[PDB]
Amino acid sequence: PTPVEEAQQKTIEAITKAINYMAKRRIGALLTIERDTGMGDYIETGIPLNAKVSSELLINIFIPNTPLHDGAVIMKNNEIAAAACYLPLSESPFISKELGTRHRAAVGISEVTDSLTIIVSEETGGVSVAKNGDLHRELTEEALKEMLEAE
Amino acid sequence: PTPVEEAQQKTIEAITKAINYMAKRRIGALLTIERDTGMGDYIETGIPLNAKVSSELLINIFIPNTPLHDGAVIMKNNEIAAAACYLPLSESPFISKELGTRHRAAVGISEVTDSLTIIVSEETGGVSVAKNGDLHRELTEEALKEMLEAE
Ligand SMILES: COCCc1nnc(N)o1
Ligand SMILES: [Mg+2]
């Protein structure tokens, strides 16, 4: 494996550890991974971090009632670019009616970028992904990790 | 002001805002600013961040019972280098006997470096600074700002 490949594997491990922990605790989270469509316009709406990824930092960002927890984290490769970012809300009718703004924001950004967004529900602890305008819900840990590896 | 001056002032403002928030809520915190003595060996004991400073990120690091709040934040070159770092405990017999490990850690690093460390007490919300082996206690907001600007 090249350094680039090993760095990706470390980032994927950090993300999955954070998501799994938040899911167990019903910590709502919204995490968008930029791909080939640049997300600068959305990154610039948040608080700049440009931080090395760690599971610890991801979890801390989303603790309720803290400055960084509302809005999206946007990751660029192996960095957390910004937190508390705006994303556009989707009007798709295929978003389950009980879901709130984090899921609608995730699907929204997925309609205008090739990004992958992970959502943790504060109601249920369920994990979902938005990509290309579709929301895939109730993901097992294994499924999430495979989706990230394939991404 | 020059660019470097504006950047230093912005960092001081971020620090003081975070410290004020933590003092009000009696959130324990430990924040060491590296100066001429290199602290890489201590930075390496924590979780790497290399992040832009913001009051928001500082607060989100120090949330009680979260991954990153156990240990010191170390700042270097106008960035948060790492969190949850080890600092050496002072053996000085001249620290107020009611103070515990965060304050002893701050004094300890200040005995072997020219760094400036800020401490917020979880017991009282009092703010103190360690430099040169001494602890300056019960600081007002103006006092802490003066110390940061002098530094
Ligand atoms: C070690 O703690 C369990 C996982 C965790 N990491 N960071 C937070 N806040 O939790
Ligand atoms: Mg299903």
Of the ligands numbered here, which is closest to the C-alpha atom of A137? 2
The amino acid at A2:
T
Maximum separation of any 2 CA atoms in chain B, in Å:
44
Rounded distance between C-alpha atoms, residue A37 and residue A115, angstroms:
7
Residue nearest to atom 7 of ligand 1 (CA): B67
**B62, B19 in Cβ contact below 8 A?**
no
Tokens 């950004």 sit at which residue?
A109
Residue by residue, DSSP assigns A77-141 as: TTEEEEEEE--PPP--TTS-TT--HHHHHHHHHHTTSS-EEEEE-TTT--EEEEETTEEE-S--H
Record the resolution, in angstroms: 1.1
Counting every residue written for chain A, the total comes to 151
Q: How far is it, in rounded angstroms, from Cα A117 to Cα B110?
A: 44
Phi, psi (rounded to 5 degrees) for B100: -110, -150
- Which residue from A22, A3, A59 is spatially nearest to A141, judged by alpha carbons? A22
Cβ within 8 Å of residue B30, ≥6 positions away: B71, B72, B73, B87, B102, B105, B106, B117, B118, B119
Q: Is the CB of residue A57 below 6 angstroms from any atom belonging to ligand 1? A: no
Long-range contacts at B87-93 (CB < 8 A, ≥ 24 apart): B87/B30, B87/B32, B87/B42, B87/B117, B88/B112, B90/B133, B92/B133
Other beta carbons within 10 Å of A138: 10
Measured distance CA(A37)–CA(A56) in Å, rounded: 27
> Would you state the structure tokens that stand for residue A107, as one six-digit string?
């699907």
* Interface probe, candidates A10, A17, A27, A49, chain B, greatest B C-beta count within 10 A: A49
Report whether A80 contacts A43 (CB < 8 A): no
Which residue type, as a one-letter code, is found at position A33? I
Give residue A7's identity as a one-letter amino acid code. A
d(CA B117, CA B113): 10
Q: Which domains does chain B have, with CATH numbers?
A: 3-150 (3.40.1700.10)
Closest CA to A32 of A138, A112, A96: A112
Residue with tokens 């700002």: B145
Give the residue among A130, A27, A35 at the shortest CA–CA distance from A88. Answer: A130
Residue A9 CB partners (closer than 8 Å, separation 6+): A1
Asked if residues A130 and A106 have their Cβ atoms less than 8 Å apart, the reply is yes
Distance, CA of A30 to CA of A72 (rounded, Å): 5
Contacts of B51 in chain A (CB under 8 A): 49-52, 80
Ligand 1 pocket, A101 CB below 6 A? no
Q: Which two tokens stand for residue A4?
A: 């680039």
